[PDB]
Amino acid sequence: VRPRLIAELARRVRALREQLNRPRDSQLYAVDYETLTRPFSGRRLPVRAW
Amino acid sequence: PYPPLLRAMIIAERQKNGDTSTEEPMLNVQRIRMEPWDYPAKQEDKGRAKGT
Amino acid sequence: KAYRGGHLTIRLALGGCTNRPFYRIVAAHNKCPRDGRFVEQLGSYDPLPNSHGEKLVALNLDRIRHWIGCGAHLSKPMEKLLGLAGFFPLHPMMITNAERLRRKRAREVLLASQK
Amino acid sequence: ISPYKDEPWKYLESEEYQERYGSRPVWADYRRNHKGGVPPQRTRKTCIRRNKVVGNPCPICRDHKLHVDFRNVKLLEQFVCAHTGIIFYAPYTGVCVKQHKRLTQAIQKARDHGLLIYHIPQVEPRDLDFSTSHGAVSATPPAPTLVSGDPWYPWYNWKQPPERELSRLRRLYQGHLQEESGPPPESMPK
Amino acid sequence: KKPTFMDEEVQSILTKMTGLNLQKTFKPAIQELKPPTYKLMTQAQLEEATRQAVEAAKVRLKMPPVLEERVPINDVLAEDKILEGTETTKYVFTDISYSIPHRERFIVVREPSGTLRKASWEERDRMIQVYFPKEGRKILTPIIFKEENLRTMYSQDRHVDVLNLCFAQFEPDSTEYIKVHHKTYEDIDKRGKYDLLRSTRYFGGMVWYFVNNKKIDGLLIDQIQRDLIDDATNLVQLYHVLHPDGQSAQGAKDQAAEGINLIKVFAKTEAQKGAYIELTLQTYQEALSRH
Amino acid sequence: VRSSVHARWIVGKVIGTKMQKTAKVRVTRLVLDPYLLKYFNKRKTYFAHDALQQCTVGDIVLLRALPVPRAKHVKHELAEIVFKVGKVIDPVTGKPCAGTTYLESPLSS
Amino acid sequence: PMKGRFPIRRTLQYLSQGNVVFKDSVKVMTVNYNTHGELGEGARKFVFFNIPQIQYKNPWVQIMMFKNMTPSPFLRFYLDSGEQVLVDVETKSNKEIMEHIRKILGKNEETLREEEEEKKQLSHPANFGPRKYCLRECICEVEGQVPCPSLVPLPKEMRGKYKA
Amino acid sequence: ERGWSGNSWGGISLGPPDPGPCGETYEDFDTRILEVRNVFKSIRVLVAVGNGKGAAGFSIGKATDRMDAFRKAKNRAVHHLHYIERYEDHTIFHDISLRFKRTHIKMKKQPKGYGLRCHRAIITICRLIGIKDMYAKVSGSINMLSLTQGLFRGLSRQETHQQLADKKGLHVVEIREECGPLPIVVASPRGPLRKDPEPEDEVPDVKLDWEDVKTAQGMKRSVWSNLKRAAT
Amino acid sequence: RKTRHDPLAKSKIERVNMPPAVDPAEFFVLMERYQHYRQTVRALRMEFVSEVQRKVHEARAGVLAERKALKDAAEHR
RNA sequence: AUAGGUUUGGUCCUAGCCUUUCUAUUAGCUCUUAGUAAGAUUACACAUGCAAGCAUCCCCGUUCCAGUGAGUUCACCCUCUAAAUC
Ligand code: FES
Ligand SMILES: [K+]
Ligand SMILES: [K+]
Ligand SMILES: [Mg+2]
Ligand SMILES: [Mg+2]
Ligand SMILES: [Mg+2]
Ligand SMILES: [Mg+2]
Ligand SMILES: [Mg+2]
Ligand SMILES: [Zn+2]
């Protein structure tokens, strides 16, 4: 089997970059009260919570 | 009580094996405690939104 | 084949032809296709009434009990079928639908009386 | 027009049939026209197309007095092997597919009516034990609910919720409420 | 107690009365044929092969048990009135677990009214044939069993074929099985066709029916005419043990009747056609003396 | 359950002894020819651990599977020497033999 | 004609006529026999006629043969436990050898019947599926049930084209 | 009616043989042409005759005119008749494998209703003989004269059940699958019967044919075998 | 079906899934019915699990299996 | 293969080619109705519109289903043992 080292390198780099670029609670759980959407993702909250 | 068909099978097997008890087959539900759907869950096991 | 997560479920796989459905009650991985690979066939269900006016349901109850005891889930139509068989309690939604149909027919009868 | 339509079997003990065929099968002298030494593996579909016969009609279609009927047992026997009871395949006798299907149906009907003798084997019993004592075929003791006329479980019946719970739900679903439903009809409305 | 049809004594009497004709028992079947095989055999080897064939014939002639008509199944497992009117057709639920005897297999019906009940015998048989098909059985009753078709079969002297079809189609304790067997026996008795069932597994059942219905005159006549005097005497003895309180048995005890004397006492006491029995017996005795 | 090696017990002939504490053994099995329906010998090479170096080229040995492979190709060990090359002891009578003749007569004891 | 002496040996019927199914303990069978000498004659026939049948019925059992290594012919069986079973076959006929090995290390007929019954359970007759696995494809093949639309067109009322 | 083909002489009937100089009539015999060949001009014809009851023969006739050749061949054939033994007057007594020169013929006894599954010339000759059920395979050179000669030799050298019983001094017992384990004695020795049984041969040293075995085991895949054909 | 890399449809940018209207009485009765049904079903599932594990234990180290193993070992001896 | 045609002035033998059988695709010409099944040549490039949401916010899902046959002994059995369901 030909070694697949680029895959391992990519996996390790992605893991490192995810554990150094963690989004914080202030970013993840912020809300725009006028539109009731998460600015981090843009996804609208369910109606029953508005 | 057991469901009708399952109760019938339990009784039929009981009679086949020679036992002639008249006691109804019965399901214990004491150990099945019904938790309200809004009871707090384990936050430790919950995931997190991935950065992107 | 390894699926990410998933579980065994007892469900209905559709066979037959156009306008003529037939169901095989099978235990299969929930991620597998509806009519694809399965672990074991646990019965059948012909939804069309036959020449005797009957809907035939075959249930391999020993194997159904075995697979439930092995951690298999159940699709809602399968739960309703087992409720009709008397193997399970009648599903809440069957009772609710029966009550809703009763109320609708009462409304229709009241309309007829009003007219 | 044949005078034997109502009673086809008559044609087989008429002297005309004896002159034409004698004691040999009605298909004995027939021969298919084809290229090569190996014939095609199916016969023609039908010798009669829009009330017109083809050049070489098959044994059944060449004689209009021969009627494929389940009561014409003597004719049907000529298309069944007397030593094995197996219906000859169509290229064996040269009958077209239509008449072969008709003969097969007639033979099956004659066998089902007891008019054609066929081998009926002797089989073993379905079950080893003939007891009828099991609960599957005997009577199961009625459950107490079945005696008392109650549902199998109490929750099968509608119970009006308390007013406090209904008010709590009306507070929870402000502005998205539908008309409150009372207890359902006790029986199915007719 | 009164003997059963499976009693070893009754079984032995009926086995000897049936007979064992190898040529009839192993008549050439009309089926797909294969080239025969050939063996060089001594006299001893031929005798051993004949004995093995006799054993195979004995296995083939084993008598089906005679069963009483099954009682109808009328049992309600539940009455869920909430489901009434929600469905237009009944549901039939068959438990198809492999290792269960078919008479211990749970088959239930959910009716449109909401009643969960047990299946009837006919429904049970139909479902078992649906899911566990048996060679020779059909889901729907064949039309051969109608009155006119069975009359045709009788007119062709194909009674054994009718009984084989009945055995393949119906269960022994079913109403249809009992009715068809009884009508075949009645035809045989009415037309003196007892030899048709000899050396078959149905002769014992036919004899049992005749004895239990007190109509052994025709069979006794046939046995006397075929010079099977031992069979007739055994038939009379079986009649006596089945009906030990009848006039015939008491007369046989009183007169110490044995052998042909038993037949004479039966003809004088409890024969619907005793005069013709006496005539045939006298003819048999006269021919025996002449020979 | 006791081993991860497929071949549990195998009889073979020693064909090599040039490795340290390892015997190279030739094992033949009978394989059916699908077309001819005749059984032919199929050969496979096995490395067997021989701690004492008691194996000689040409002797018939029994090999038992190791619980786990001790090397890339060494998955078995020498359970015993069934037939020492040129030093066969007749298992039936227990006497030494040279081919089909008794070196020591069975009657001698 | 078929090549070789006794070509019947190279037929599947002959190979399946074998009656020795070894227990699961037997792993290896060594057959030591002599090419010459009347006393081992039966053993030679055992190699000629019965080893193919034994191998056919026991594919995973290693069978190995040895010639003219000992004064007498013998069989040795090696078991999974490490036990070895020695069977002297000198002065015996090949039938005697077959019967002996069947008796001492062969599965009895009861166990084989139990295995066959266990096999039967896998092919459940009530299961519907391909002919390769099931007696029937679909419930439409059962008499009295609604037939396939391929053969019998369904009435206009139960078809979606005329229900819409 | 046509022969094996529309333009072929083979299979054509020539009618009954003419009354002979010996004074015998042959109205119960039928004649069939097997081959017609130009000899370089004259004509050589191979014909076969038979009464359908085991009496059959064949002959070569050479003449400048075809009809004279037919007559010569037919008249000579009636005076060189074979008698062919038939098992139950419908088939042969046992399988026959023969080679005449380079032509191999392998014939198999078959049950009733099997019909004649044979080379067309063999079908014609079997109809003349009265054999109604048989299988035959012809291999090697397909030479009509050699085929006819080999067929007649093989059919004339078959051992009946009675001959086998007299030779071995034992009962010949027939086992039929349709008749169960019933032993049917088809032949018994006319002389005394041996009290010693035949050696129960564990494995007979019979020469098997790879075609028969391959057909039995299911590795014969020929698209030409077991094809539907007209009744023969 | 779409993968997580496929963009959302432009026709669905402004879509709100309005929750369905609620009937208080039926809602409450349905909640109670689901609770009771799920309790019964969990009891049945636990019984089936106990049955399965019991069958496994009986197959591996049951009295019948022990006697069979002893008989087989002896008969081999 | 139940075989057949074809080398020579002729016979026999050997030997190839072809015919007869059954499927699939495409082409010509010709085609009425009903039911069912199946349905790009191309791992070439793609306009356009849809194919993943749900839900009192967290999460969960979008790693599935659906598609293709480019590459190609990763698929099967045993041992061991994660993740997952109960
Ligand atoms: S295959 Fe069953 S309906 Fe078509
Ligand atoms: K969610
Ligand atoms: K590919
Ligand atoms: Mg022409
Ligand atoms: Mg050629
Ligand atoms: Mg030329
Ligand atoms: Mg076209
Ligand atoms: Mg784990
Ligand atoms: Zn026609």
Numbering used by the authors:
A (entry chain 0): 6 to 55
B (entry chain 0): 165 to 216
C (entry chain M): 10 to 124
D (entry chain O): 48 to 237
E (entry chain R): 66 to 356
F (entry chain N): 4 to 112
G (entry chain T): 2 to 165
H (entry chain D): 190 to 229, 239 to 430
Question: Which sentences from the paper describe this structure?
Answer:
Mitochondrial ribosomes (mitoribosomes) synthesize proteins encoded within the mitochondrial genome that are assembled into oxidative phosphorylation complexes.
As a C-terminal tethering peptide of bS21m is already observed in state B, it is likely that this segment of bS21m is responsible for the initial docking and eventual incorporation of the bS21m–S11m–h23 module in state C upon dissociation of ERAL1. Although ERAL1 binds in a manner allowing for conformational freedom of the rRNA 3′ end, RBFA binds in a stabilizing manner, sandwiching the free rRNA 3′ end between its KH domain, an N-terminal helical peptide of RBFA, and bS21m. The bS21m-mediated rigidification of the platform observed between states B and C is accompanied by a concerted rRNA compaction that results in the formation of a NAD-binding site at the base of the platform, which stabilizes a series of single-stranded rRNA linkers in the platform. Together, the replacement of ERAL1 with RBFA, the docking of h23, uS11m and bS21m, and NAD binding aid in the orchestrated compaction towards a rigid platform. Furthermore, TFB1M initially sequesters h45, preventing h45 from interacting with and stabilizing the mature conformation of h44 until TFB1M methylates two residues in h45 and departs during the transition from state C to state D. As a result, this molecular clamp inhibits the premature folding of decoding centre rRNA elements and forms an assembly checkpoint in which h45 methylation is required for maturation of the decoding centre. In states A–D, the presence of both of these factors prevents compaction of the 3′ major rRNA domain, splaying rRNA elements and protein modules apart to allow for significant intermodule flexibility.
